[PDB]
Amino acid sequence: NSLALHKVIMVGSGGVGKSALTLQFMYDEFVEDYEPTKADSYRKKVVLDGEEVQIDILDTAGQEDYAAIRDNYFRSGEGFLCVFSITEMESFAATADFREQILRVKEDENVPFLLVGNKSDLEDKRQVSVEEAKNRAEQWNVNYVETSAKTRANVDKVFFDLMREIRARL
Ligand SMILES: Nc1nc2c(ncn2[C@@H]2O[C@H](COP(=O)(O)OP(=O)(O)O)[C@@H](O)[C@H]2O)c(=O)[nH]1
Ligand SMILES: *S(=O)(=O)c1ccc(S(=O)(=O)Nc2cccnc2OC)c2c1OCCO2
Ligand SMILES: [Ca+2]
Ligand SMILES: [Ca+2]
Ligand SMILES: [Ca+2]
Protein backbone atom coordinates (compact mmCIF):
# COMPACT_ATOMS: atom_id res chain seq x y z
CA ASN A 1 0.00 0.00 0.00
CA SER A 2 2.77 2.40 1.01
CA LEU A 3 5.02 3.73 -1.74
CA ALA A 4 8.67 4.43 -1.17
CA LEU A 5 9.07 8.19 -0.66
CA HIS A 6 12.45 9.53 -1.77
CA LYS A 7 13.13 12.93 -0.21
CA VAL A 8 15.40 15.01 -2.44
CA ILE A 9 16.76 18.43 -1.59
CA MET A 10 18.10 20.85 -4.19
CA VAL A 11 21.00 22.92 -2.87
CA GLY A 12 23.42 25.33 -4.46
CA SER A 13 24.05 29.07 -4.72
CA GLY A 14 21.81 31.53 -6.51
CA GLY A 15 20.96 31.31 -10.19
CA VAL A 16 22.66 27.96 -10.81
CA GLY A 17 19.41 26.33 -11.99
CA LYS A 18 17.90 24.62 -8.96
CA SER A 19 14.42 25.78 -9.90
CA ALA A 20 14.86 25.30 -13.63
CA LEU A 21 16.05 21.73 -13.08
CA THR A 22 13.18 21.00 -10.71
CA LEU A 23 10.53 22.45 -12.99
CA GLN A 24 11.92 20.73 -16.09
CA PHE A 25 11.76 17.42 -14.26
CA MET A 26 8.37 18.09 -12.81
CA TYR A 27 6.48 19.80 -15.67
CA ASP A 28 8.62 19.34 -18.82
CA GLU A 29 9.05 23.11 -19.18
CA PHE A 30 12.14 25.35 -19.14
CA VAL A 31 11.19 28.17 -16.75
CA GLU A 32 13.53 31.14 -16.90
CA ASP A 33 11.97 33.67 -14.48
CA TYR A 34 11.22 31.69 -11.31
CA GLU A 35 11.30 34.04 -8.30
CA PRO A 36 14.86 33.65 -6.95
CA THR A 37 13.63 33.84 -3.34
CA LYS A 38 10.66 31.46 -3.79
CA ALA A 39 11.10 27.99 -2.28
CA ASP A 40 8.71 25.16 -2.96
CA SER A 41 8.31 21.43 -2.45
CA TYR A 42 7.16 19.14 -5.26
CA ARG A 43 5.80 15.61 -5.17
CA LYS A 44 5.44 13.27 -8.14
CA LYS A 45 4.78 9.58 -8.66
CA VAL A 46 7.57 8.08 -10.76
CA VAL A 47 8.36 4.54 -11.88
CA LEU A 48 11.95 3.94 -10.73
CA ASP A 49 13.45 0.79 -12.28
CA GLY A 50 9.96 -0.63 -12.58
CA GLU A 51 8.90 0.25 -9.01
CA GLU A 52 6.32 2.96 -8.49
CA VAL A 53 7.68 5.41 -5.91
CA GLN A 54 7.03 8.97 -4.82
CA ILE A 55 9.71 11.65 -5.21
CA ASP A 56 9.60 14.72 -2.98
CA ILE A 57 11.80 17.60 -4.13
CA LEU A 58 12.53 20.55 -1.85
CA ASP A 59 13.65 23.33 -4.20
CA THR A 60 15.53 25.50 -1.68
CA ALA A 61 15.84 29.20 -2.49
CA GLY A 62 18.41 30.31 0.07
CA GLN A 63 16.04 32.30 2.26
CA GLU A 64 16.35 30.28 5.49
CA ASP A 65 19.16 32.12 7.27
CA TYR A 66 18.50 30.65 10.75
CA ALA A 67 20.99 27.82 11.06
CA ALA A 68 18.90 25.53 13.24
CA ILE A 69 16.00 25.67 10.76
CA ARG A 70 18.26 25.17 7.74
CA ASP A 71 19.72 22.15 9.49
CA ASN A 72 16.23 20.86 10.22
CA TYR A 73 15.35 21.04 6.52
CA PHE A 74 18.56 19.15 5.66
CA ARG A 75 17.95 16.53 8.34
CA SER A 76 14.63 15.66 6.71
CA GLY A 77 16.31 15.14 3.36
CA GLU A 78 17.47 11.73 2.21
CA GLY A 79 19.42 12.78 -0.88
CA PHE A 80 20.90 15.97 -2.23
CA LEU A 81 21.44 17.44 -5.66
CA CYS A 82 24.28 19.87 -5.10
CA VAL A 83 24.02 22.16 -8.07
CA PHE A 84 26.43 24.73 -9.44
CA SER A 85 26.55 26.52 -12.77
CA ILE A 86 29.41 25.64 -15.09
CA THR A 87 29.35 29.33 -16.08
CA GLU A 88 30.02 30.68 -12.56
CA MET A 89 33.19 29.56 -10.82
CA GLU A 90 32.06 31.02 -7.49
CA SER A 91 29.02 28.73 -7.55
CA PHE A 92 31.32 25.73 -7.93
CA ALA A 93 33.42 26.97 -5.02
CA ALA A 94 30.22 27.38 -2.97
CA THR A 95 29.36 23.69 -3.34
CA ALA A 96 31.95 22.91 -0.67
CA ASP A 97 29.86 24.80 1.90
CA PHE A 98 26.65 22.95 1.08
CA ARG A 99 28.55 19.69 1.29
CA GLU A 100 29.92 20.52 4.72
CA GLN A 101 26.48 21.64 5.90
CA ILE A 102 24.94 18.37 4.75
CA LEU A 103 27.68 16.26 6.33
CA ARG A 104 27.38 18.09 9.66
CA VAL A 105 23.65 17.27 9.71
CA LYS A 106 23.54 13.80 8.17
CA GLU A 107 26.79 12.65 9.85
CA ASP A 108 27.35 10.22 6.98
CA GLU A 109 29.89 10.85 4.23
CA ASN A 110 27.97 8.41 2.00
CA VAL A 111 24.72 10.37 2.16
CA PRO A 112 23.05 10.17 -1.28
CA PHE A 113 24.51 13.13 -3.08
CA LEU A 114 25.26 14.15 -6.66
CA LEU A 115 27.48 17.06 -7.76
CA VAL A 116 25.51 18.62 -10.64
CA GLY A 117 27.15 21.01 -13.07
CA ASN A 118 24.21 22.78 -14.69
CA LYS A 119 24.01 24.96 -17.85
CA SER A 120 25.97 22.53 -20.02
CA ASP A 121 24.41 24.16 -23.05
CA LEU A 122 26.54 27.26 -22.38
CA GLU A 123 29.87 25.64 -23.17
CA ASP A 124 31.15 28.95 -24.60
CA LYS A 125 30.61 30.55 -21.14
CA ARG A 126 32.18 27.71 -19.12
CA GLN A 127 34.22 28.85 -16.13
CA VAL A 128 34.44 25.47 -14.36
CA SER A 129 36.34 22.75 -16.17
CA VAL A 130 34.95 19.27 -16.44
CA GLU A 131 38.27 18.02 -15.06
CA GLU A 132 38.16 20.13 -11.91
CA ALA A 133 34.53 19.25 -11.20
CA LYS A 134 35.28 15.56 -11.75
CA ASN A 135 38.27 15.86 -9.42
CA ARG A 136 36.14 17.37 -6.67
CA ALA A 137 33.55 14.63 -7.13
CA GLU A 138 36.31 12.06 -6.85
CA GLN A 139 37.56 13.68 -3.62
CA TRP A 140 34.03 13.42 -2.18
CA ASN A 141 33.30 9.97 -3.65
CA VAL A 142 30.22 11.30 -5.43
CA ASN A 143 29.21 11.16 -9.06
CA TYR A 144 29.49 14.28 -11.22
CA VAL A 145 26.76 14.85 -13.82
CA GLU A 146 26.45 17.85 -16.13
CA THR A 147 22.92 18.96 -16.88
CA SER A 148 21.02 21.48 -18.89
CA ALA A 149 17.61 22.59 -17.67
CA LYS A 150 17.24 24.25 -21.07
CA THR A 151 17.80 21.21 -23.32
CA ARG A 152 16.72 18.67 -20.63
CA ALA A 153 20.12 16.93 -20.89
CA ASN A 154 20.61 14.62 -17.89
CA VAL A 155 17.72 16.14 -15.97
CA ASP A 156 15.90 12.86 -15.48
CA LYS A 157 19.30 11.23 -14.91
CA VAL A 158 20.23 13.29 -11.88
CA PHE A 159 16.88 12.75 -10.18
CA PHE A 160 16.67 9.06 -11.00
CA ASP A 161 20.28 8.37 -10.10
CA LEU A 162 19.88 10.18 -6.81
CA MET A 163 16.81 8.10 -6.04
CA ARG A 164 18.83 4.98 -6.85
CA GLU A 165 21.40 6.06 -4.25
CA ILE A 166 18.67 6.68 -1.68
CA ARG A 167 17.16 3.28 -2.47
CA ALA A 168 20.48 1.48 -2.15
CA ARG A 169 21.90 3.24 0.91
CA LEU A 170 18.88 3.73 3.17
N1 LIG B 1 21.07 28.44 -20.61
C1 LIG B 1 20.67 27.89 -19.45
N2 LIG B 1 20.12 28.72 -18.55
C2 LIG B 1 19.70 28.19 -17.38
C3 LIG B 1 19.81 26.76 -17.11
N3 LIG B 1 19.30 26.55 -15.90
C4 LIG B 1 18.88 27.73 -15.41
N4 LIG B 1 19.11 28.68 -16.32
C5 LIG B 1 18.78 30.10 -16.18
O1 LIG B 1 19.45 30.62 -15.04
C6 LIG B 1 18.56 31.51 -14.34
C7 LIG B 1 18.50 31.02 -12.92
O2 LIG B 1 17.93 29.72 -12.87
P1 LIG B 1 17.11 29.24 -11.58
O3 LIG B 1 16.65 27.84 -11.89
O4 LIG B 1 16.06 30.27 -11.27
O5 LIG B 1 18.31 29.27 -10.51
P2 LIG B 1 18.19 29.00 -8.91
O6 LIG B 1 18.41 30.33 -8.20
O7 LIG B 1 19.33 28.06 -8.64
O8 LIG B 1 16.85 28.37 -8.62
C8 LIG B 1 17.25 31.52 -15.12
O9 LIG B 1 17.25 32.63 -16.02
C9 LIG B 1 17.27 30.28 -15.98
O10 LIG B 1 16.59 30.36 -17.21
C10 LIG B 1 20.43 25.95 -18.15
O11 LIG B 1 20.61 24.74 -17.99
N5 LIG B 1 20.82 26.56 -19.26
S1 LIG C 1 9.75 26.11 5.27
O1 LIG C 1 8.99 27.21 5.86
O2 LIG C 1 9.09 24.97 4.64
C1 LIG C 1 11.00 26.74 4.17
C2 LIG C 1 11.40 25.94 3.12
C3 LIG C 1 12.39 26.39 2.28
C4 LIG C 1 12.92 27.65 2.51
S2 LIG C 1 14.23 28.22 1.41
O3 LIG C 1 14.34 27.13 0.44
O4 LIG C 1 13.93 29.57 0.92
N1 LIG C 1 15.63 28.28 2.35
C5 LIG C 1 16.33 27.07 2.67
C6 LIG C 1 15.72 25.87 2.90
C7 LIG C 1 16.52 24.78 3.24
C8 LIG C 1 17.89 24.94 3.37
N2 LIG C 1 18.42 26.13 3.17
C9 LIG C 1 17.69 27.17 2.84
O5 LIG C 1 18.27 28.43 2.62
C10 LIG C 1 19.62 28.51 2.99
C11 LIG C 1 12.52 28.48 3.57
C12 LIG C 1 11.56 28.03 4.39
O6 LIG C 1 11.08 28.81 5.47
C13 LIG C 1 11.33 30.19 5.28
C14 LIG C 1 12.75 30.47 4.80
O7 LIG C 1 13.13 29.74 3.68
CA1 LIG D 1 12.24 7.61 2.19
CA1 LIG E 1 15.15 28.98 -7.30
CA1 LIG F 1 9.21 14.56 -18.11
Short mmCIF file of N, CA, C and O in Angstrom, two decimals, residues 15-124:
data_model
loop_
_atom_site.label_atom_id
_atom_site.label_comp_id
_atom_site.label_asym_id
_atom_site.label_seq_id
_atom_site.Cartn_x
_atom_site.Cartn_y
_atom_site.Cartn_z
N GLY A 15 20.96 31.27 -8.74
CA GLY A 15 20.96 31.31 -10.19
C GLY A 15 21.61 30.14 -10.90
O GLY A 15 21.82 30.22 -12.12
N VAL A 16 21.98 29.09 -10.17
CA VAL A 16 22.66 27.96 -10.81
C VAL A 16 21.70 27.06 -11.58
O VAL A 16 22.15 26.31 -12.45
N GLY A 17 20.41 27.11 -11.28
CA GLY A 17 19.41 26.33 -11.99
C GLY A 17 18.65 25.33 -11.15
O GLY A 17 18.10 24.36 -11.69
N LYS A 18 18.65 25.52 -9.83
CA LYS A 18 17.90 24.62 -8.96
C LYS A 18 16.44 24.59 -9.35
O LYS A 18 15.84 23.52 -9.52
N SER A 19 15.83 25.76 -9.53
CA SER A 19 14.42 25.78 -9.90
C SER A 19 14.19 25.29 -11.31
O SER A 19 13.26 24.52 -11.56
N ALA A 20 15.03 25.72 -12.24
CA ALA A 20 14.86 25.30 -13.63
C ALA A 20 14.98 23.79 -13.77
O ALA A 20 14.20 23.16 -14.51
N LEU A 21 15.95 23.19 -13.08
CA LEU A 21 16.05 21.73 -13.08
C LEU A 21 14.80 21.08 -12.51
O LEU A 21 14.24 20.14 -13.09
N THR A 22 14.33 21.59 -11.37
CA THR A 22 13.18 21.00 -10.71
C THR A 22 11.96 21.08 -11.61
O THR A 22 11.24 20.09 -11.79
N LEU A 23 11.73 22.26 -12.19
CA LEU A 23 10.53 22.45 -12.99
C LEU A 23 10.60 21.72 -14.31
O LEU A 23 9.57 21.29 -14.81
N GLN A 24 11.79 21.56 -14.89
CA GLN A 24 11.92 20.73 -16.09
C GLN A 24 11.56 19.29 -15.76
O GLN A 24 10.80 18.64 -16.48
N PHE A 25 12.09 18.78 -14.66
CA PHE A 25 11.76 17.42 -14.26
C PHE A 25 10.28 17.28 -13.96
O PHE A 25 9.65 16.27 -14.32
N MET A 26 9.70 18.29 -13.32
CA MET A 26 8.37 18.09 -12.81
C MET A 26 7.33 18.30 -13.92
O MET A 26 6.32 17.58 -13.99
N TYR A 27 7.52 19.33 -14.77
CA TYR A 27 6.48 19.80 -15.67
C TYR A 27 6.94 19.87 -17.12
O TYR A 27 6.19 20.36 -17.96
N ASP A 28 8.15 19.40 -17.43
CA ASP A 28 8.62 19.34 -18.82
C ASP A 28 8.62 20.73 -19.46
O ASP A 28 8.29 20.88 -20.64
N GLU A 29 8.97 21.75 -18.68
CA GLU A 29 9.05 23.11 -19.18
C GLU A 29 10.34 23.74 -18.68
O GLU A 29 10.74 23.51 -17.54
N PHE A 30 11.00 24.52 -19.54
CA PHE A 30 12.14 25.35 -19.14
C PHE A 30 11.59 26.69 -18.69
O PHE A 30 11.02 27.43 -19.50
N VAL A 31 11.74 26.99 -17.40
CA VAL A 31 11.19 28.17 -16.75
C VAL A 31 12.35 29.08 -16.37
O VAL A 31 13.22 28.68 -15.59
N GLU A 32 12.36 30.28 -16.95
CA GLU A 32 13.53 31.14 -16.90
C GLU A 32 13.41 32.31 -15.94
O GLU A 32 14.38 33.04 -15.76
N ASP A 33 12.25 32.48 -15.28
CA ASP A 33 11.97 33.67 -14.48
C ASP A 33 11.53 33.34 -13.06
O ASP A 33 10.97 34.21 -12.38
N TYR A 34 11.77 32.12 -12.59
CA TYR A 34 11.22 31.69 -11.31
C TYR A 34 11.80 32.55 -10.20
O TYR A 34 13.02 32.68 -10.07
N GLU A 35 10.92 33.15 -9.40
CA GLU A 35 11.30 34.04 -8.30
C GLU A 35 12.52 33.48 -7.56
O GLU A 35 12.44 32.42 -6.93
N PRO A 36 13.65 34.19 -7.60
CA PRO A 36 14.86 33.65 -6.95
C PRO A 36 14.72 33.38 -5.47
O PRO A 36 15.45 32.52 -4.95
N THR A 37 13.81 34.05 -4.77
CA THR A 37 13.63 33.84 -3.34
C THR A 37 12.48 32.89 -3.02
O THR A 37 12.20 32.67 -1.83
N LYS A 38 11.83 32.30 -4.02
CA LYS A 38 10.66 31.46 -3.79
C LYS A 38 11.11 30.01 -3.65
O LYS A 38 11.70 29.46 -4.57
N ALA A 39 10.86 29.41 -2.50
CA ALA A 39 11.10 27.99 -2.28
C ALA A 39 9.79 27.24 -2.46
O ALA A 39 8.69 27.80 -2.36
N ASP A 40 9.90 25.96 -2.75
CA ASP A 40 8.71 25.16 -2.96
C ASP A 40 9.11 23.70 -2.86
O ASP A 40 10.25 23.34 -3.13
N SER A 41 8.17 22.87 -2.42
CA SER A 41 8.31 21.43 -2.45
C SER A 41 7.41 20.88 -3.55
O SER A 41 6.33 21.43 -3.82
N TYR A 42 7.86 19.78 -4.16
CA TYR A 42 7.16 19.14 -5.26
C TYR A 42 7.08 17.66 -4.97
O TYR A 42 8.04 17.07 -4.47
N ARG A 43 5.97 17.04 -5.35
CA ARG A 43 5.80 15.61 -5.17
C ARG A 43 5.21 15.01 -6.43
O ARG A 43 4.22 15.52 -6.97
N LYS A 44 5.81 13.91 -6.89
CA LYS A 44 5.44 13.27 -8.14
C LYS A 44 5.58 11.76 -7.98
O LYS A 44 6.52 11.29 -7.33
N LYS A 45 4.64 11.02 -8.55
CA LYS A 45 4.78 9.58 -8.66
C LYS A 45 5.67 9.30 -9.86
O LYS A 45 5.46 9.86 -10.94
N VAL A 46 6.67 8.45 -9.67
CA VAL A 46 7.57 8.08 -10.76
C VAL A 46 7.92 6.60 -10.64
O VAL A 46 8.03 6.05 -9.55
N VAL A 47 8.07 5.97 -11.80
CA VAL A 47 8.36 4.54 -11.88
C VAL A 47 9.87 4.43 -11.97
O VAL A 47 10.46 4.78 -13.00
N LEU A 48 10.50 4.06 -10.86
CA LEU A 48 11.95 3.94 -10.73
C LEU A 48 12.35 2.48 -10.88
O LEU A 48 12.03 1.65 -10.02
N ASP A 49 13.03 2.15 -11.98
CA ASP A 49 13.45 0.79 -12.28
C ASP A 49 12.30 -0.19 -12.13
O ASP A 49 12.46 -1.30 -11.63
N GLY A 50 11.13 0.22 -12.62
CA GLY A 50 9.96 -0.63 -12.58
C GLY A 50 9.11 -0.52 -11.33
O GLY A 50 7.97 -1.02 -11.32
N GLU A 51 9.60 0.14 -10.29
CA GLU A 51 8.90 0.25 -9.01
C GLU A 51 8.28 1.63 -8.91
O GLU A 51 8.98 2.63 -9.06
N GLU A 52 6.98 1.68 -8.68
CA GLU A 52 6.32 2.96 -8.49
C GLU A 52 6.71 3.51 -7.12
O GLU A 52 6.59 2.82 -6.10
N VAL A 53 7.22 4.73 -7.11
CA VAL A 53 7.68 5.41 -5.91
C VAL A 53 7.16 6.84 -5.96
O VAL A 53 6.64 7.30 -6.98
N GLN A 54 7.29 7.54 -4.85
CA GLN A 54 7.03 8.97 -4.82
C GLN A 54 8.34 9.70 -4.61
O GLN A 54 9.13 9.32 -3.74
N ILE A 55 8.58 10.74 -5.40
CA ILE A 55 9.71 11.65 -5.21
C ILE A 55 9.17 12.93 -4.59
O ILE A 55 8.09 13.41 -4.95
N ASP A 56 9.87 13.42 -3.58
CA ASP A 56 9.60 14.72 -2.98
C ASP A 56 10.84 15.56 -3.18
O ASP A 56 11.94 15.13 -2.81
N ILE A 57 10.68 16.72 -3.82
CA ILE A 57 11.80 17.60 -4.13
C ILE A 57 11.58 18.90 -3.36
O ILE A 57 10.57 19.58 -3.56
N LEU A 58 12.49 19.22 -2.45
CA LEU A 58 12.53 20.55 -1.85
C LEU A 58 13.47 21.41 -2.68
O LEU A 58 14.69 21.17 -2.72
N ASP A 59 12.90 22.40 -3.36
CA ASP A 59 13.65 23.33 -4.20
C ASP A 59 14.00 24.51 -3.29
O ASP A 59 13.23 25.46 -3.18
N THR A 60 15.15 24.44 -2.62
CA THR A 60 15.53 25.50 -1.68
C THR A 60 15.93 26.77 -2.43
O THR A 60 16.50 26.72 -3.53
N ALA A 61 15.62 27.92 -1.84
CA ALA A 61 15.84 29.20 -2.49
C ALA A 61 16.73 30.11 -1.66
O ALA A 61 16.78 31.32 -1.94
N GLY A 62 17.38 29.58 -0.63
CA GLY A 62 18.41 30.31 0.07
C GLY A 62 17.91 31.26 1.13
O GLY A 62 18.73 31.99 1.73
N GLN A 63 16.60 31.29 1.38
CA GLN A 63 16.04 32.30 2.26
C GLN A 63 16.16 31.96 3.74
O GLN A 63 16.12 32.88 4.57
N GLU A 64 16.27 30.68 4.09
CA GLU A 64 16.35 30.28 5.49
C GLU A 64 17.75 30.61 6.00
O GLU A 64 18.70 29.86 5.76
N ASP A 65 17.87 31.71 6.73
CA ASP A 65 19.16 32.12 7.27
C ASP A 65 19.38 31.67 8.71
O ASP A 65 20.50 31.80 9.22
N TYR A 66 18.34 31.14 9.38
CA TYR A 66 18.50 30.65 10.75
C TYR A 66 19.03 29.22 10.70
O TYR A 66 18.40 28.33 10.13
N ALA A 67 20.21 29.03 11.30
CA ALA A 67 20.99 27.82 11.06
C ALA A 67 20.28 26.59 11.57
O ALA A 67 20.33 25.54 10.92
N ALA A 68 19.59 26.70 12.71
CA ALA A 68 18.90 25.53 13.24
C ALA A 68 17.80 25.06 12.29
O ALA A 68 17.60 23.86 12.12
N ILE A 69 17.09 26.01 11.68
CA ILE A 69 16.00 25.67 10.76
C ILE A 69 16.55 25.10 9.46
O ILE A 69 16.00 24.15 8.91
N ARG A 70 17.62 25.71 8.93
CA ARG A 70 18.26 25.17 7.74
C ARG A 70 18.70 23.74 7.98
O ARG A 70 18.49 22.85 7.14
N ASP A 71 19.30 23.50 9.14
CA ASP A 71 19.72 22.15 9.49
C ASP A 71 18.54 21.21 9.61
O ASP A 71 18.61 20.04 9.19
N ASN A 72 17.42 21.69 10.14
CA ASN A 72 16.23 20.86 10.22
C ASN A 72 15.76 20.46 8.83
O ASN A 72 15.39 19.31 8.62
N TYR A 73 15.74 21.40 7.88
CA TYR A 73 15.35 21.04 6.52
C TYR A 73 16.31 19.99 5.94
O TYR A 73 15.89 19.03 5.27
N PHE A 74 17.61 20.13 6.19
CA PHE A 74 18.56 19.15 5.66
C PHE A 74 18.38 17.79 6.33
O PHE A 74 18.48 16.74 5.68
N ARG A 75 18.10 17.79 7.63
CA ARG A 75 17.95 16.53 8.34
C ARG A 75 16.81 15.71 7.77
O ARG A 75 16.89 14.47 7.75
N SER A 76 15.76 16.37 7.29
CA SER A 76 14.63 15.66 6.71
C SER A 76 14.99 15.07 5.36
O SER A 76 14.36 14.10 4.93
N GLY A 77 15.98 15.63 4.67
CA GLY A 77 16.31 15.14 3.36
C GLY A 77 17.00 13.79 3.43
O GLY A 77 17.78 13.50 4.33
N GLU A 78 16.77 12.99 2.40
CA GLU A 78 17.47 11.73 2.21
C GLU A 78 18.54 11.78 1.13
O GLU A 78 19.49 11.00 1.19
N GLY A 79 18.41 12.66 0.15
CA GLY A 79 19.42 12.78 -0.88
C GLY A 79 19.48 14.21 -1.35
O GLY A 79 18.49 14.95 -1.26
N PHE A 80 20.64 14.58 -1.89
CA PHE A 80 20.90 15.97 -2.23
C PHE A 80 21.43 16.09 -3.64
O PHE A 80 22.33 15.35 -4.04
N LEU A 81 20.85 17.00 -4.41
CA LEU A 81 21.44 17.44 -5.66
C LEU A 81 22.14 18.74 -5.33
O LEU A 81 21.50 19.74 -5.01
N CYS A 82 23.45 18.72 -5.41
CA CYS A 82 24.28 19.87 -5.10
C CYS A 82 24.66 20.51 -6.42
O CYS A 82 25.58 20.05 -7.11
N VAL A 83 23.98 21.60 -6.74
CA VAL A 83 24.02 22.16 -8.07
C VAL A 83 24.92 23.38 -8.07
O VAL A 83 24.84 24.22 -7.17
N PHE A 84 25.72 23.50 -9.11
CA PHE A 84 26.43 24.73 -9.44
C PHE A 84 26.23 24.99 -10.92
O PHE A 84 25.72 24.14 -11.66
N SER A 85 26.61 26.18 -11.36
CA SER A 85 26.55 26.52 -12.77
C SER A 85 27.95 26.41 -13.34
O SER A 85 28.87 27.02 -12.80
N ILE A 86 28.10 25.69 -14.44
CA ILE A 86 29.41 25.64 -15.09
C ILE A 86 29.88 27.02 -15.54
O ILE A 86 31.06 27.19 -15.86
N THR A 87 28.98 28.00 -15.62
CA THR A 87 29.35 29.33 -16.08
C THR A 87 29.74 30.27 -14.95
O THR A 87 30.07 31.42 -15.21
N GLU A 88 29.70 29.82 -13.69
CA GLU A 88 30.02 30.68 -12.56
C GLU A 88 30.94 29.93 -11.60
O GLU A 88 30.49 29.11 -10.78
N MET A 89 32.22 30.26 -11.65
CA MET A 89 33.19 29.56 -10.82
C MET A 89 32.85 29.68 -9.33
O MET A 89 33.06 28.73 -8.57
N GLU A 90 32.34 30.83 -8.90
CA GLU A 90 32.06 31.02 -7.49
C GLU A 90 30.97 30.08 -7.02
O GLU A 90 30.95 29.69 -5.85
N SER A 91 30.09 29.66 -7.94
CA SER A 91 29.02 28.73 -7.55
C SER A 91 29.58 27.32 -7.37
O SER A 91 29.12 26.56 -6.51
N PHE A 92 30.60 26.98 -8.15
CA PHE A 92 31.32 25.73 -7.93
C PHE A 92 32.07 25.76 -6.60
O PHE A 92 32.01 24.80 -5.83
N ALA A 93 32.78 26.86 -6.32
CA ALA A 93 33.42 26.97 -5.02
C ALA A 93 32.42 26.82 -3.88
O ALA A 93 32.73 26.17 -2.86
N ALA A 94 31.22 27.40 -4.03
CA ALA A 94 30.22 27.38 -2.97
C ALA A 94 29.72 25.98 -2.66
O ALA A 94 29.21 25.76 -1.56
N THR A 95 29.87 25.03 -3.59
CA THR A 95 29.36 23.69 -3.34
C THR A 95 30.04 23.07 -2.13
O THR A 95 29.44 22.25 -1.44
N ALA A 96 31.27 23.45 -1.85
CA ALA A 96 31.95 22.91 -0.67
C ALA A 96 31.19 23.23 0.61
O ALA A 96 31.12 22.40 1.52
N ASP A 97 30.58 24.41 0.69
CA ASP A 97 29.86 24.80 1.90
C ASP A 97 28.60 23.96 2.07
O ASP A 97 28.28 23.51 3.18
N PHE A 98 27.84 23.78 0.99
CA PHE A 98 26.65 22.95 1.08
C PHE A 98 27.02 21.54 1.48
O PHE A 98 26.34 20.92 2.32
N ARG A 99 28.11 21.02 0.93
CA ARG A 99 28.55 19.69 1.29
C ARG A 99 28.86 19.61 2.77
O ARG A 99 28.43 18.68 3.45
N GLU A 100 29.61 20.57 3.30
CA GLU A 100 29.92 20.52 4.72
C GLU A 100 28.66 20.63 5.57
O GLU A 100 28.54 19.96 6.61
N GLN A 101 27.72 21.48 5.16
CA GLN A 101 26.48 21.64 5.90
C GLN A 101 25.70 20.33 5.94
O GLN A 101 25.20 19.92 6.99
N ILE A 102 25.64 19.64 4.81
CA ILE A 102 24.94 18.37 4.75
C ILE A 102 25.63 17.34 5.62
O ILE A 102 24.97 16.62 6.39
N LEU A 103 26.96 17.24 5.53
CA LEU A 103 27.68 16.26 6.33
C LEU A 103 27.54 16.52 7.83
O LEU A 103 27.46 15.57 8.62
N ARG A 104 27.56 17.79 8.24
CA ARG A 104 27.38 18.09 9.66
C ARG A 104 26.03 17.57 10.14
O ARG A 104 25.92 17.12 11.29
N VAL A 105 25.00 17.65 9.30
CA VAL A 105 23.65 17.27 9.71
C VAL A 105 23.43 15.78 9.58
O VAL A 105 22.88 15.13 10.48
N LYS A 106 23.81 15.21 8.43
CA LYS A 106 23.54 13.80 8.17
C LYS A 106 24.58 12.88 8.80
O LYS A 106 24.28 11.70 9.00
N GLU A 107 25.76 13.40 9.14
CA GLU A 107 26.79 12.65 9.85
C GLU A 107 27.13 11.36 9.12
O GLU A 107 27.40 10.33 9.74
N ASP A 108 27.15 11.42 7.79
CA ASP A 108 27.35 10.22 6.98
C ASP A 108 27.94 10.68 5.64
O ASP A 108 27.27 11.32 4.82
N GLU A 109 29.22 10.40 5.44
CA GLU A 109 29.89 10.85 4.23
C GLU A 109 29.36 10.15 2.98
O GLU A 109 29.66 10.59 1.86
N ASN A 110 28.57 9.09 3.13
CA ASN A 110 27.97 8.41 2.00
C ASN A 110 26.51 8.82 1.79
O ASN A 110 25.75 8.12 1.12
N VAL A 111 26.10 9.93 2.37
CA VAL A 111 24.72 10.37 2.16
C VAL A 111 24.47 10.48 0.66
O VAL A 111 25.34 10.98 -0.07
N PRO A 112 23.33 10.03 0.15
CA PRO A 112 23.05 10.17 -1.28
C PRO A 112 23.22 11.62 -1.71
O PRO A 112 22.62 12.54 -1.15
N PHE A 113 24.03 11.81 -2.74
CA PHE A 113 24.51 13.13 -3.08
C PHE A 113 25.09 13.08 -4.48
O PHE A 113 25.93 12.23 -4.77
N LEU A 114 24.66 13.98 -5.35
CA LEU A 114 25.26 14.15 -6.66
C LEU A 114 25.78 15.59 -6.78
O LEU A 114 25.10 16.54 -6.39
N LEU A 115 26.97 15.75 -7.36
CA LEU A 115 27.48 17.06 -7.76
C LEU A 115 26.97 17.30 -9.18
O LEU A 115 27.25 16.50 -10.08
N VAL A 116 26.19 18.35 -9.37
CA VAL A 116 25.51 18.62 -10.64
C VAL A 116 26.04 19.92 -11.22
O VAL A 116 25.87 20.99 -10.63
N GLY A 117 26.69 19.83 -12.38
CA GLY A 117 27.15 21.01 -13.07
C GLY A 117 26.12 21.39 -14.11
O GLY A 117 26.09 20.78 -15.17
N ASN A 118 25.32 22.41 -13.83
CA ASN A 118 24.21 22.78 -14.69
C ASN A 118 24.66 23.85 -15.70
O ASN A 118 25.73 24.45 -15.58
N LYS A 119 23.81 24.04 -16.73
CA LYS A 119 24.01 24.96 -17.85
C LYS A 119 25.04 24.43 -18.86
O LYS A 119 25.79 25.20 -19.46
N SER A 120 25.04 23.13 -19.08
CA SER A 120 25.97 22.53 -20.02
C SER A 120 25.72 22.95 -21.45
O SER A 120 26.58 22.72 -22.31
N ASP A 121 24.61 23.63 -21.72
CA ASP A 121 24.41 24.16 -23.05
C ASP A 121 25.10 25.50 -23.26
O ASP A 121 24.95 26.09 -24.34
N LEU A 122 25.81 26.01 -22.26
CA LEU A 122 26.54 27.26 -22.38
C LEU A 122 28.03 26.98 -22.34
O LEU A 122 28.77 27.62 -21.59
N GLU A 123 28.47 26.03 -23.17
CA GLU A 123 29.87 25.64 -23.17
C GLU A 123 30.78 26.84 -23.40
O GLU A 123 31.89 26.90 -22.85
N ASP A 124 30.35 27.78 -24.25
CA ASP A 124 31.15 28.95 -24.60
C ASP A 124 31.27 29.94 -23.43
O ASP A 124 32.09 30.84 -23.50
#
